[PDB]
Structure formats: structure tokens, C-alpha cells
Design a protein around this nucleic acid. Sequence first.
RNA 1: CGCGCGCGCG
RNA 2: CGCGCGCGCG
Length: 76
Amino acid sequence: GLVPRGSHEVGALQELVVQKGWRLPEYTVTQESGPAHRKEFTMTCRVERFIEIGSGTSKKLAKRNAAAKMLLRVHT
RNA sequence: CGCGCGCGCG
RNA sequence: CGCGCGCGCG
């Protein structure tokens, strides 16, 4: 849904996992639905033992929502 | 963030 | 004309 205004989800996760001594997350598009004029995307984020998904009206939004979810997973 | 070219839509 | 997608660049 929403990421905090002016926060950098993908870069923050990348920087966090580097400091935990983990390899960089892997992002893959794992779903696309709807017509070409109202598309929705799902990105999967994988790092260490975790797998979290994010979705959005664009791939960039989907990926940012995937990173946010992963940040929540790793920090909690 | 902004722009070009190409594609698909509406 | 927009939303999106691909490529590319600042």
C-alpha cells in the first residue's frame, strides 16, 4: 500500500542486508494481471531465508512495495 | 527526477 | 493524449 513519503525502500533494504553480511536481494516479476491500460504487477523479493511480495500499478511501485515488506520482515 | 525513440492499451 | 511496457540517455 503506502511507503513513507520521501523514503528509499529498495536502497534502504540493500544497505541493510549488506550490513547484516547477506548477499543482495533478488527481485523477480512473478505476476501481471489486467488489461494493458489498467495493469497491475507483483514483484517477489528474496533475500537470505525470506520471500516477500509487493504489488502495484507499475513494476517500480511493485518493487518498492516488495522492498518495504521485506524491510518489515527483516526488522521484525 | 526529466527527456527521446519504439510497442501495447484506453 | 494519457496509464503502462521495452530500449536508451541526461
